Amino acid sequence: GKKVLIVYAHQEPKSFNGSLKNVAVDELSRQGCTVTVSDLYAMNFEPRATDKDITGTLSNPEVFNYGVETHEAYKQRSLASDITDEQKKVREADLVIFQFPLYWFSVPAILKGWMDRVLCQGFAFDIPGFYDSGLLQGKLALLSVTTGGTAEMYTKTGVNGDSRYFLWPLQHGTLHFCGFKVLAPQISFAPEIASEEERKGMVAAWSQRLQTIWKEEPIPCTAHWHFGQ
Amino acid sequence: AGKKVLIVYAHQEPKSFNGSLKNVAVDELSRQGCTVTVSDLYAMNFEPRATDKDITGTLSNPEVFNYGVETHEAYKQRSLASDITDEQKKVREADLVIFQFPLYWFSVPAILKGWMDRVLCQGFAFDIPGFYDSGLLQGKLALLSVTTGGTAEMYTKTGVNGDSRYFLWPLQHGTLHFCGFKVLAPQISFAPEIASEEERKGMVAAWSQRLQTIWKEEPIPCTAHWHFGQ
Ligand SMILES: Cc1cc2nc3c(=O)[nH]c(=O)nc-3n(C[C@H](O)[C@H](O)[C@H](O)COP(=O)(O)OP(=O)(O)OC[C@H]3O[C@@H](n4cnc5c(N)ncnc54)[C@H](O)[C@@H]3O)c2cc1C
Ligand SMILES: Cc1cc2nc3c(=O)[nH]c(=O)nc-3n(C[C@H](O)[C@H](O)[C@H](O)COP(=O)(O)OP(=O)(O)OC[C@H]3O[C@@H](n4cnc5c(N)ncnc54)[C@H](O)[C@@H]3O)c2cc1C
Ligand SMILES: COc1ccc(C2=Nc3ccc(OC)cc3C2=O)cc1
Ligand SMILES: COc1ccc(C2=Nc3ccc(OC)cc3C2=O)cc1
Ligand SMILES: [Zn+2]
Ligand SMILES: [Zn+2]
DSSP lists the bridge partners of residue A188 as: A146
Q: Please check whether residue A225 touches B, CB under 8 A.
A: no
Among the partner residues B13, B111, B230, nearest to A65 by beta-carbon distance: B13
Q: What lines the ligand 2 site, CB under 6 Å?
A: A 49, 65-67, 116, 173; B 11, 16-18, 20, 102-106, 147-150, 192-193, 200-201, 204
DSSP lists the bridge partners of residue A114 as: none
Q: Which of B54, B63, B66, B115 to mutate to test the pocket of ligand 1 (most atoms within 8 A of CB)?
A: B66
To the nearest 10 degrees (0 to 180), the angle between helices A109-118 and B110-119 is: 180
- A173–B105 CB contact, under 8 Å: yes
Phi and psi of A31, rounded to 5°?
A: -70, -15
Atom of ligand 1 nearest to the CA of B69: 53
CA–CA distance from A229 to each of A156, A224, A226, B158 (Å)?
Answer: 11, 7, 9, 17
* Nearest chain B CA: its distance from A87 CA (Å): 17
Nearest to A53 by CA among A63, A68, A38: A68
Give the integer Cα–Cα distance in Å for B68 and B54.
11
Q: Please check whether residue A226 touches B, CB under 8 A.
A: yes
Structure obtained using = X-ray
Nearest to B83 by CA among B58, B123, B49, B127: B49
Residue B13: closest CA among chain A residues belongs to which residue? A64
Give residue A102 CA to ligand 6 midpoint distance, Å.
Answer: 17
Give residue B150 CA to ligand 4 midpoint distance, Å.
Answer: 5
Give the integer Cα–Cα distance in Å for B217 and B228.
22
Q: Please check whether residue B177 touches A, CB under 8 A.
A: no
Strands (DSSP E) found in chain A: 3-8, 34-39, 95-101, 140-146, 181-182, 186-188
Nearest to A164 by CA among A138, A145, A136: A145
Atom of ligand 1 nearest to the CA of A154: 11
* Helices within A100-195 (DSSP H only): 109-118, 163-170
Q: Give the SS3 label for residue B35.
A: strand
Nearest to A46 by CA among B42, B17, B81: B42
Burial string for B4-15 (b: 16+ CB within 10 Å, else e) reads bbbbbbbbbeee
Give residue B226 CA to ligand 2 midpoint distance, Å.
Answer: 27
Q: Is the CB of A103 inside a 6 Å radius of any atom of ligand 1?
A: yes
Resolution in A: 1.9
CA–CA distance from A221 to each of A39, A98, A105, A218, B157 (Å)?
Answer: 27, 17, 18, 8, 15
Give the integer Cα–Cα distance in Å for B109 and A116.
7
| Ligand with the closest atom to the CA of B179 | 3
Give the integer Cα–Cα distance in Å for B39 and B24.
15
Among the partner residues B63, B110, B166, nearest to A116 by beta-carbon distance: B110
DSSP lists the bridge partners of residue A126 as: A129
List of domains in chain B: 1-230 (3.40.50.360)
A136 close to A90: Cβ distance less than 8 angstroms? yes
Q: Is it true that the peptide bond before B219 is cis, omega within 30 degrees of 0?
A: no
Q: Please check whether residue B161 touches A, CB under 8 A.
A: yes
Q: Please check whether residue A211 touches B, CB under 8 A.
A: no
Give residue A125 CA to ligand 4 midpoint distance, Å.
Answer: 10
Give residue B149 CA to ligand 2 midpoint distance, Å.
Answer: 6
Per-window interface: A 54-113 vs B, CB < 8 A: 63-67, 103-110, 112-113
CA–CA distance from A134 to each of A123, A161, A179, B59 (Å)?
Answer: 9, 30, 4, 45
Burial string for A84-114 (b: 16+ CB within 10 Å, else e) reads bebbebbeebebbbbbbbbbbbbbbbbbbbb
Q: Which of A10, A111, A192 to mutate to test the pocket of ligand 1 (most atoms within 8 A of CB)?
A: A192
Q: Is A56 left (phi over 0), alpha (psi -120 to 50) or beta?
A: left
Helix (H), strand (E) counts: chain A: 7, 6
Q: Count of A–B CB contacts within 8 Å?
A: 151
Residue B194: closest CA among chain A residues belongs to which residue? A127
